[PDB]
Design a binder for this molecule. Structure first.
Ligand code: PC1
Ligand code: PC1
Ligand code: PC1
Ligand code: PC1
Ligand code: 3PE
Ligand code: 3PE
Ligand code: 3PE
Ligand code: SF4
Ligand code: SF4
Ligand code: SF4
Lengths: 97, 104, 165, 318, 388, 70, 158, 176
């Protein structure tokens, strides 16, 4: 059974992102198609998901905005695009977002 | 005629990629570069000879599968076994007399 | 330039030779591969090449000297030579066969039409133009600084050319 | 129509070689506890393409080879032979049905040592040449075991025809009555293809300069491609010998799928082994052959000569 | 001398220990003479320290044996305390002993994994280096730097362990013993591993002592000697562990002394997570260890000391001393003179590798070339300490 | 997870599948949906030669039957 | 479809730049402590290999040199000798404080005060040592740099 | 205490010997090593998907140097030159003069970031929590000069990370 139950989670990760085109968009921007609680969002468009069932290090992640400070970051993200407030939570320096 | 063509295509294509990858990368003008700057070990030679002889004795055994189809098996089996037995002596003689030095 | 900048200095150098130059290397390479020396009348050309370092020192000394304003200088090697002699001298250093007697292309044109024209031209003799020694520089004989230029061309007792006094 | 068949056999090979590098770099990671290439394209599926483009456009070095004539022959030889080995293979239909297919494959692989010798014989280094010989002294040494072990099996098959090996295993795989051979035949394939733990060339690069170090980016992609082409062929050859799949003339594709799976599993085992053992010192990989494998290989050769006669298990000559 | 080879490690293979330019003489395949050239990483450490205050000089010691960071700091700290004639408080001595054995885990993981990397066994490198990471986080959370801590200092440590650290350290130790078994399952009994190590690099007990070998280069030769059990310094007279001993004194034994030691540390760490006492973590003497900030920002007598101790440093009585510790590689030790002022007059460092490397020529006599690879690794050489 | 290796394996598997599949179909296409004749020995090559003559169209894969008995 | 030469050329430049940036084969000069951090970037947690950065590449097959560690005078000549043997294009990454500017050992007699005295550097990763993740950012910084080159365009307009 | 790590004397009974013989002739031990690796192929790899994920740090982490401000806005540094006197690498250059209003403040404050060793002694010495090591660790540059911070480049980090520098000290200053 379990093997069948896995295929459910596979599909729930397509509805999780809201449609195939949503599925692909993350698949190529982030290479990971996990789905997690939207802990919040920032003014620049970054979205900080999370999942507490993942091993310590991968529970918390981000999806950078497709545009920042008037620059196209649809592909050209970098780790210096996280404002300081979130910067402390995303690095597990603290627990309260 | 096929195999004559097969080798030709298997090797003609090998030439292309060799020349394609040797010249066209040259036609990219990457400036230019200045000028950057044997002992005969016997053991090496032996293993060539050692394999050389053992390779000949193998040449005699290649027709074995056809041999087993003859009626004179008693002769076939003996001479079939005689060769392989000697091929062990050749190995034994070199081994026994300290002839496999390169193995060390 | 002279009309626009009456104080501007101007330098008239020979065909400079050096490690990355395109004068000595031009002979060594183009001829060798699939090519036979195409020297067009090599006995009617006189060349007096100069060292790249020697030219460089003058330019630096040109800046420093207050008297190099407006004047026109001419840098030339210590010795004139006949084109045929050098080409043999080159091949003599390069250790390559000598056989006296490549269109313009996209990318980088090698063996251009005009470049062949420019080699034929002879070195002007202009004693009225102040030379390197007027700056304190010393010219370097092509004999010394030819091996290091052509060393790479060589694969793994040799006489220099004949000057034209 | 035939030229189409050749191109539709050469081209798939080259693609498969490219994506074996992808699979290799990932299977290692998961055995090494890491993902491996999963960025370039989706799941790294474009990683090989970027490699091929990158290498070729890269500037090639100045070999300065004493012999330029041989410096080009070597890769031509290596890459041509690697492809030539695939024409007699039945899958289940050989491109060029050969009666002596086994000998054709056995003889061809022997020529391959020239590329390992011509290259080092033009590098112009007193060290690369020495390293080149050691590589040759290893290939030829193990080809002895290949032939004998290969020959012993044919006694239970009766002919040099490759497509006949399918018939011999109709009632069972050949791994069953010959597993002592398979153990050594497998290893003999590793050493012959110069793989870990027998990949001395790459491992001892610093101590003794490898033979291929002087070759540039472009050409190197040929030697490297040639090697990985052989690895697949040997495993395909292995599966054919010992894991033959029943052949249905009505639905050949079934055979191809199953035959492909067996070949793929064998190839992965080549990757599994690389990430499991240290490397053999040169003398020790010789001690293994002359003093451990060769005696046993001879003993089994007599045993397989005797066995069909005494048990009346002589296969048909045809 | 059939032919001499100047084997240089320019293309440094993934060793992370520096580059060694080795000059050899092969009589065919044997090695008739091996000559190491080392100075490539001589930075002048022993002369810079002349210009630094005793506090400013400490970070240099994280940069000698850069896989045994806190162990080095302990040696320098013990030397200075001994000169200063002061005793740290017990809680610090336990933290130092706690980490001194955590570092030993970091070091031995480096030695075995790389030593196994140079011989082609590559997979174990990744598995164990994932344990180093989690071990760095402990380094990270107590000092803030993943590798070079400067945590240990003359007179104790710098800061106390953050709350909840020891819960993690306990958690890490619980699972670790399985990790080693995942390793010994690869190399311990594997025939290929034994071939490359068995009866290789044999050193006699009598020669080792004369040639200055220390640490696992002794215990491999059956000698029973380990400074912890014989000249204990901090608390090592309060922990039960057994010193592994070799039998044949070859590479394989020294591979088993190290693997065995990595277990014996889990036996010590376990004890330090139970005997750790409450208290402060630096000598309660504000002329040597700077005072707490809160007291620095409130009390005059303390403010002065925070001033002088961070600009002029703390004087030290004139005198000389040689202090050594059982560092993971060998007997690390520093001979350190002091003229009375805040700057040491001289700091000789007895790097354990420097002695071992001299013995390289002795051990490689009558050995094939590829054994010189194994011999260098089994000595556990890092060229930060050798050249300094 | 480990299953993400499979696409690389599967894509390679196709590359290994084409050479076998192409040859099987190609032989059928030429030989009119029959396994390509195999002629290892002159007897076989002899029959495969006669069959061409009997075919009457210079093709050896056109196998005639009792309809040609006349 | 009518495609202007600049448009046709422009896209090619993006293709090759994608190839070079997507597949970097580094060479590591593990001269000193910063080498250890460089390993941790190959360790499982960061697994640089997945971006395309293979762990070990010979000098002649390399695309980027990583000068991780100090550079003493004695070791300087071999650094350049290795550099000059790199087939172009070749990018040099200076990692650590002792390679950016001679770091802790800046004033020592036997130290070269930065590799930039000896080779042209492209990226400077600061820290003693930079965290394994800090270096990984430095690599991902280079890839973007290789993505902004206009090799063809410049050629097209000569 | 001690213990022999290798002093075994294998029993020579036939069963014992046959085991060793069974081990050599069939590669049992080598197989057992293959088993271990085959298990790792079925475990979740420990790889974090950087940059979308970040390896965990702690509030004590030492990163880019930065200069703080009081809540009012005034500067915290008072040119006491203690940070300059202890920086082991001598990477801090301070030059101060009385300010136009009589205050004591710096005019030059350069932290050459290619001589810094990120020791952390600077912030340990500052008596007014002025110079602190932020938590930023991603500032690799494309030229050397960009790593020669001057006072203007340090404050901007202060006026850019104070939303986190302040939080960390609150989390950890008690241990100091
Ligand atoms: C041999 C076959 C290999 C061919 C590989 C794909 C060929 C075309 C890919 C391409 O150019 O896409 C560019 C684009 C570049 O992105 P882009 O140009 O679409 O960015 C703009 C996107 N919008 C408009 C939405 C803002 O990348 C891809 O589409 C991903 C292609 C990879 C998928 C390959 C998977 C199977 C292998
Ligand atoms: C190298 C390959 C050379 C060709 C060898 C082909 C072969 O022997 O396979 C046996 C193969 C198969 O052997 P077979 O005996 O199993 O099948 C023969 C056909 N039957 C069974 C029907 C009778 O022989 C052939 O298929 C005949 C090929 C045509 C004859 C060859 C003519 C010229 C061959 C090339 C000459 C050399 C070219 C230059 C070489 C340069 C140096 C490398
Ligand atoms: C079987 C498959 C084989 C494996 C795959 C091989 C790759 C195939 C796909 C990629 C091919 C792209 C080849 C591009 C060549 C490499 C790029 C390069 O290095 O260029 C740098 C060079 C640099 O030129 P440069 O001007 O800078 O040269 C001087 C530079 N210095 C002085 C520093 C040395 O540019 C080229 O040479 C490009 C040549 C032209 C490329 C073709 C464009 C044709 C269309 C233009 C005309 C349109 C008019 C309208
Ligand atoms: C083209 C015919 C001649 C033969 C050429 C050689 C054989 C065929 C192979 C061609 C390569 C095709 C695959 C290209 C894939 C493009 C990159 C990609 O996959 O998207 C991912 C990447 C994703 O962006 P990224 O690279 O920044 O990824 C960063 C990492 N993430 C996303 C996780 C943060 O796409 C791009 O980056 C866009 C770059 C521009 C692509 C330029 C190439 C376009 C194709 C031009 C072809 C021109 C041919 C002449 C006409
Ligand atoms: C019932 C049979 C019982 C076994 C018979 C005795 C087996 C021999 C055991 C022996 O004593 O050999 C010891 C010695 C070891 O040699 P070696 O390993 O090279 O020592 C230095 C290695 N560094 O051995 C030697 O030095 C020389 C050994 C030579 C043996 C060569 C074997 C090759 C042939 C394999 C057998 C082929 C068929 C044999 C002939 C058929 C007989 C019926
Ligand atoms: C009644 C009729 C009876 C007839 C039959 C009777 C005989 C049957 C029983 C005997 C069968 C013997 C099988 C022979 C295989 C070779 C085994 C062998 O002996 O190898 C020994 C070799 C070196 O010997 P060593 O371990 O060093 O011992 C010291 C000796 N002085 O050590 C080695 O082997 C080295 C191994 C190198 C390869 C290791 C890396 C690969 C291992 C993983 C692959 C495992 C095999 C996978 C099989 C794939 C099949 C497709
Ligand atoms: C497949 C992945 C591996 C599964 C785990 C392997 C395993 O644990 O089996 C161990 C077993 C013996 O292990 P060992 O501890 O060495 O016992 C020695 C007793 N004399 O090892 C074995 O019994 C397997 C030995 C097989 C040797 C090769 C057999 C034929 C190979 C070609 C098929
Ligand atoms: S930069 Fe840092 S890690 Fe690198 S050598 Fe210098 S002190 Fe060591
Ligand atoms: S971290 Fe240390 S070396 Fe760096 S600036 Fe601060 S005090 Fe100086
Ligand atoms: S940063 Fe702090 S220690 Fe340095 S001068 Fe300013 S106030 Fe003094």
């Amino acid at each position: 059974m379990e093997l069948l139950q896995v295929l459910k989670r596979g599909l729930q990760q397509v509805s999780g992102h809201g449609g195939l085109r949503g599925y692909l968009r993350v698949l190529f921007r982030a290479n990971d198609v996990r789905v997690g609680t939207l802990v919040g969002e920032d003014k620049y468009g970054n979205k900080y998901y999370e999942d507490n069932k993942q091993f310590f290090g991968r529970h918390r992640w981000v999806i950078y905005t497709t545009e920042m400070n008037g620059k196209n970051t649809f592909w050209d993200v970098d780790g210096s695009m996280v404002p300081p407030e979130w910067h402390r939570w995303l690095h597990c320096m603290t627990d309260d977002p | 005629m096929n195999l004559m063509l097969a080798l030709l295509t298997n090797f003609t294509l090998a030439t292309l990629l060799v020349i394609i990858a040797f010249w066209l990368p040259q036609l990219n003008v990457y400036s230019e570069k200045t000028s950057p700057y044997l002992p005969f070990s016997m053991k090496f030679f032996l293993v060539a000879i050692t394999f050389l002889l053992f390779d000949l004795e193998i040449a005699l055994l290649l027709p074995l599968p056809w041999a087993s189809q003859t009626a004179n098996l008693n002769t076939m089996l003996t001479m079939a076994l005689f060769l392989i037995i000697l091929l062990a002596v050749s190995l034994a003689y070199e081994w026994t007399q300290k002839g496999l030095e390169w193995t060390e | 330039v002279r009309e626009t900048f009456p104080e501007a200095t101007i330098i008239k150098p020979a065909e400079i030779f050096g490690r990355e130059d395109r004068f000595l290397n031009y002979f060594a390479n183009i001829r060798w591969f699939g090519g036979v020396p195409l020297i067009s009348l090599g006995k009617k050309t006189v060349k007096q090449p100069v060292y790249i370092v020697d030219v460089t020192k003058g330019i630096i000394n040109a800046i420093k000297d207050p008297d190099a304003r407006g004047k026109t200088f001419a840098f030339v090697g210590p010795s004139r030579y006949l084109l045929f002699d050098l080409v043999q001298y080159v091949f003599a250093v390069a250790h390559r066969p000598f056989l006296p007697y490549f269109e313009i292309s996209p990318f980088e044109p090698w063996t251009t039409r005009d470049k062949v024209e420019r080699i034929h031209t002879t070195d002007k003799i202009l004693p009225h133009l102040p030379g390197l020694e007027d700056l304190g520089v010393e010219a370097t004989p092509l004999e010394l600084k030819a091996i290091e230029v052509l060393r790479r061309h060589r694969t793994y007792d040799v006489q220099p050319a004949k000057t034209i006094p | 129509m035939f030229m189409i068949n050749i191109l539709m056999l050469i081209i798939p090979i080259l693609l498969a070689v490219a994506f074996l590098t992808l699979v290799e770099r990932k299977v290692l990671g998961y055995m090494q506890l890491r993902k491996g290439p999963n960025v370039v394209g989706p799941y790294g599926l474009l990683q090989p393409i970027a490699d091929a483009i990158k290498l070729f456009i890269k500037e090639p070095l100045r070999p300065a080879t004493s012999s330029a004539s041989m410096f080009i022959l070597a890769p031509i030889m290596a890459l041509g032979l690697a492809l030539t080995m695939w024409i007699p293979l039945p899958m289940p239909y050989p491109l060029i049905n050969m009666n002596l297919g086994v000998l054709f494959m056995l003889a061809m692989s022997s020529l391959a040592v020239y590329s390992i010798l011509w290259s080092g014989w033009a590098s112009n280094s007193k060290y690369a040449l020495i390293g080149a010989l050691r590589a040759v002294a290893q290939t030829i040494s193990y080809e002895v075991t290949l032939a004998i072990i290969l020959l012993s099996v044919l006694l239970m098959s009766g002919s040099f025809t490759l497509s006949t090996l399918i018939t011999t295993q109709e009632q069972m795989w050949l791994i069953l009555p010959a597993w002592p051979l398979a153990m050594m035949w497998f290893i003999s394939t590793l050493a012959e293809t110069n793989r870990a733990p027998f990949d001395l060339t790459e491992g001892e690069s610093e101590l003794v300069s490898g033979f291929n170090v002087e070759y540039a980016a472009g050409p190197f992609a040929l030697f490297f491609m040639a090697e990985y082409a052989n690895i697949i062929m040997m495993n395909i050859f292995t599966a054919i010998l010992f894991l033959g799949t029943s052949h249905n003339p009505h639905m050949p594709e079934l055979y191809t799928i199953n035959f492909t799976i067996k070949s793929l599993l064998l190839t992965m085992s080549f990757l599994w082994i690389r990430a499991s053992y240290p490397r053999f010192r040169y003398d020790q990989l010789m001690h293994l052959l002359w003093k451990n494998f060769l005696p046993l290989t001879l003993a089994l050769c007599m045993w397989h000569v005797s066995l069909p006669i005494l048990t009346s298990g002589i296969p048909p000559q045809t | 001398l059939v032919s001499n080879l100047t084997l240089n490690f320019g293309p440094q293979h993934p060793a992370a220990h520096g580059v060694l330019r080795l000059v050899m003489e092969l009589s065919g395949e044997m090695v008739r003479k091996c000559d190491p050239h080392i100075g490539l990483l001589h930075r002048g450490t022993e002369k810079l320290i002349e210009y630094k205050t005793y506090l400013q000089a400490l970070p240099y010691f994280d940069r000698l044996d850069y896989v045994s960071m806190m162990c080095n700091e302990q040696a320098y700290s013990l030397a200075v305390e001994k000169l200063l004639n002061i005793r740290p408080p017990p809680r610090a001595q336990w933290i130092r002993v706690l980490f001194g054995e955590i570092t030993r885990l970091l070091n031995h993981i480096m030695a075995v994994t790389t030593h196994a990397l140079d011989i082609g066994a590559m997979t174990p490198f990744f598995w164990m280096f994932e344990e180093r990471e989690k071990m760095f986080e402990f380094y990270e959370r107590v000092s803030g730097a993943r590798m070079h801590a400067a945590y240990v200092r003359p007179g104790g440590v710098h800061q106390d362990l953050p709350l909840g650290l020891m819960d993690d350290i306990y958690e890490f130790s619980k699972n670790f013993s399985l990790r080693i078994d995942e390793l010994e399952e690869m190399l311990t009994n594997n025939r290929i591993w034994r071939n490359r190590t068995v009866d290789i690099g044999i050193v006699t007990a009598e020669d080792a002592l004369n040639y200055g070998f220390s640490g696992v280069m002794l215990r491999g030769s059956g000698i029973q000697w380990d400074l912890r059990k014989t000249q204990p310094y901090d608390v090592y007279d309060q922990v039960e562990f057994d010193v592994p001993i070799g039998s044949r004194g070859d590479c394989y034994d020294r591979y088993l002394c190290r693997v065995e030691e990595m277990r014996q540390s889990i036996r010590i760490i376990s004890q330090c997570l139970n005997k750790m006492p409450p208290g402060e973590i630096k000598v309660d003497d504000a002329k040597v260890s700077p005072p707490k900030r809160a007291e620095m920002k409130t009390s005059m007598e303390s403010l002065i000391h925070h001033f002088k101790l961070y600009t002029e440093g703390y004087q030290v009585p004139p005198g000389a001393t040689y202090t050594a510790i059982e560092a993971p590689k060998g007997e690390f030790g520093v001979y350190l003179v002091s003229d009375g002022s805040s700057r040491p007059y001289r700091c000789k460092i007895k790097a354990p590798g420097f002695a071992h490397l001299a013995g390289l020529d002795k051990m490689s006599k009558g050995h094939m070339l590829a054994d010189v690879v194994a011999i260098i690794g089994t000595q556990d050489i890092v060229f930060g300490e050798v050249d300094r | 997870m480990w299953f993400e290796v499979l696409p690389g394996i599967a894509v390679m598997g196709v590359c290994l599948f084409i050479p076998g599949m192409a040859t099987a179909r190609i032989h059928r296409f030429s030989n009119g949906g029959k396994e390509k004749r195999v002629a290892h020995y002159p007897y076989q090559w002899y029959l495969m030669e006669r069959d061409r003559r009997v075919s009457g169209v210079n093709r050896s894969y056109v196998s005639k039957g009792l309809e040609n008995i006349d | 479809p009518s495609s202007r030469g600049e448009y046709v050329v422009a896209k090619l430049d993006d293709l090759i730049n994608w190839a070079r940036r997507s597949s970097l084969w580094p060479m590591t000069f593990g001269l000193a402590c910063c080498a250890v951090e460089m390993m941790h970037m190959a360790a499982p947690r960061y697994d640089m290999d997945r971006f395309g950065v293979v762990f070990r590449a010979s000098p002649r097959q390399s695309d980027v040199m990583i000068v991780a560690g100090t550079l003493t005078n004695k070791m300087a000549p071999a650094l350049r000798k290795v550099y000059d043997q790199m087939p172009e294009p070749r990018y040099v990454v200076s990692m650590g404080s002792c390679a950016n500017g001679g770091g802790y050992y800046h004033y020592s007699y036997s130290v070269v005060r930065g590799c930039d005295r000896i080779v042209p550097v492209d990226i400077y990763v600061p820290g003693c040592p930079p965290t394994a993740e800090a270096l990984l950012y430095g690599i991902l910084q280079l890839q973007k740099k290789i993505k902004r080159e206009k090799r063809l365009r410049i050629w097209y307009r000569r | 205490t001690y213990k022999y790590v290798n002093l075994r004397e294998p029993s020579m009974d036939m069963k014992s010997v046959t085991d060793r013989a069974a081990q050599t002739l069939l590669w049992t031990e080598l197989i057992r090593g293959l088993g271990m690796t085959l298990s790792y192929l079925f475990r979740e790899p420990a790889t974090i998907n950087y940059p979308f994920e970040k390896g965990p740090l702690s509030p004590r982490f030492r990163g880019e140097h930065a200069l703080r401000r009081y809540p009012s806005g005034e500067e915290r540094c008072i040119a006491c030159k203690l940070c300059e006197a202890v920086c082991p690498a001598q990477a801090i250059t301070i030059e101060a003069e009385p300010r136009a209003d009589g205050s004591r403040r710096t005019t030059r404050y350069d932290i050459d970031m290619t001589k810094c060793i990120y020791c952390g002694f600077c912030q340990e010495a500052c008596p007014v929590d002025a110079i602190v090591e932020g938590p930023n660790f991603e500032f690799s540059t494309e030229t050397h000069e960009e790593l020669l911070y001057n006072k203007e480049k340090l404050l901007n980090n202060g006026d850019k990370w104070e939303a986190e520098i302040a939080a960390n000290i609150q989390a950890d200053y008690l241990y100091r």
